[PDB]
């Protein structure tokens, strides 16, 4: 399933350029309300996917011993991932945190080899190193890069974790269902302690934007986990890294983001890497 990687990439790119549009059209909105309402809205989409694909529910497969990996990955990538990424946005810029979130596959390509004993010794390493070089050639810095690598470690380790559970008796739709359930619970606990207001979600326009963003993000995650299931964690993240090309394209086309010559070079480098990987 090689095209599923690129499909996950394009759909996360659409989701991200919808999120940018949302946060640009609304000022008072905060990422904690957005993530919570996104997850609460997407839980329905996941129930729909599960009910349509196979039988109603299978809760005997949600064993407590094995799926600790998926819950720890969800609470390690969802809540604190977004928190530290917004911290990086407030610290060192709105577009460098996303660049590091795209250079994330380094920690994944390390862990999948060392921890999961995967065999990617020389094939994928070159494409991923070239993508990394392009992202670093695109660009207080010692703390900004520290928080950025803290985000990247988590977002690259959720993949290694999610490929640990799905080795035996956990399909793509359930291993993601528990992920979204636990991320929603975590964001609920976080909001409840801070008493964050929910008045903004009642808007119909915001609800429409949130449902299209949740649909895009969820198709992205579903294709990405179908890839990981049958293409592992070593390349299934490298193939998905292509979403930066898309994100930049849709930002310079639709949202009217200014185009510079350096971003064209970085996009050419990363597309060269993605083409090298196959």
């Amino acid at each position: 399933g090689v095209p599923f990687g690129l499909l996950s990439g394009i759909f996360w790119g659409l989701g991200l350029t919808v999120s940018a549009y949302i946060f640009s059209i609304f000022t008072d909105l905060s990422p904690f309300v957005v993530a919570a309402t996104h997850d609460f809205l997407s839980i329905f989409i996941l129930l729909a996917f599960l009910l349509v694909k196979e039988g109603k529910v299978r809760l005997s497969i949600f064993l407590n011993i094995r799926n600790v990996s998926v819950i720890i990955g969800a609470l390690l990538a969802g809540p604190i991932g977004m928190q530290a990424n917004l911290y990086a946005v407030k610290y060192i810029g709105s577009s460098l945190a996303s660049s590091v979130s795209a250079i994330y596959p380094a920690i994944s390509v390390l862990l999948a080899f060392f921890f999961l004993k995967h065999k990617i010794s020389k094939n994928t390493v070159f494409g991923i190193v070239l993508i990394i070089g392009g992202i670093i050639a695109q660009t207080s810095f010692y703390i900004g890069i520290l928080c950025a690598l803290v985000c990247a470690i988590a977002w690259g380790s959720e993949s290694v974790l999610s490929s640990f559970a799905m080795e035996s008796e956990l399909s793509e739709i359930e291993a993601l269902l528990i992920r979204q359930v636990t991320s929603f619970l975590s964001y609920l606990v976080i909001v409840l302690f801070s008493h964050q207001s929910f008045t903004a979600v009642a808007n119909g326009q915001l609800l429409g934007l949130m449902i299209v963003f949740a649909a895009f993000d969820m198709i992205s995650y579903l294709a990405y986990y179908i890839a990981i299931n049958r293409l592992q964690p070593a390349k299934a993240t490298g193939l998905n890294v292509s979403y930066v090309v898309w994100t930049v394209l849709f930002a310079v086309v639709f949202l009217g983001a200014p185009l510079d010559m350096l971003t064209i070079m970085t996009s050419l480098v990363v597309i060269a890497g993605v083409y090298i990987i196959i």
Partner: nanobody, 112 residues
């Protein structure tokens, strides 16, 4: 993709030495790591560079050449079917019977 044939197996008295041979046939141009198992990792050579990784239990007693496995100082614990193996792509992770996709039939070696 590649057919592996082993030769040289048999019965050997403990305290001597023995040589085992592996011949590969087919698309043999892009195979990086060659191996020798008994499925534990006992030997693995790199083709281009020419390094050989061994098992700590036999490191210094068995030797690899380019595939020939020369086993010295035999012990009755070495009675096993030895298998050949190859790897499409490899840099630093030998001795694992999940990296190597091309597998042979193996020949029996019995130490007395």
């Amino acid at each position: 993709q590649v057919q592996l044939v082993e030769s040289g197996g048999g019965s050997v008295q403990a305290g001597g030495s023995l040589r085992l041979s592996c011949a590969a046939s087919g698309t043999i141009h892009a195979i990086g790591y060659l191996g020798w198992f008994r499925r534990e990792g006992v030997a693995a050579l790199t083709t281009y560079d020419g390094w050989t990784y061994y098992a700590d239990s036999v490191k210094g007693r068995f030797t690899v050449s380019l595939v020939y496995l020369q086993m010295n100082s035999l012990k009755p614990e070495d009675t096993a079917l030895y298998y050949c193996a190859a790897a499409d792509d490899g840099w630093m992770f030998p001795l694992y019977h999940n990296h190597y996709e091309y597998w042979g039939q193996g020949t029996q070696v019995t130490v007395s």
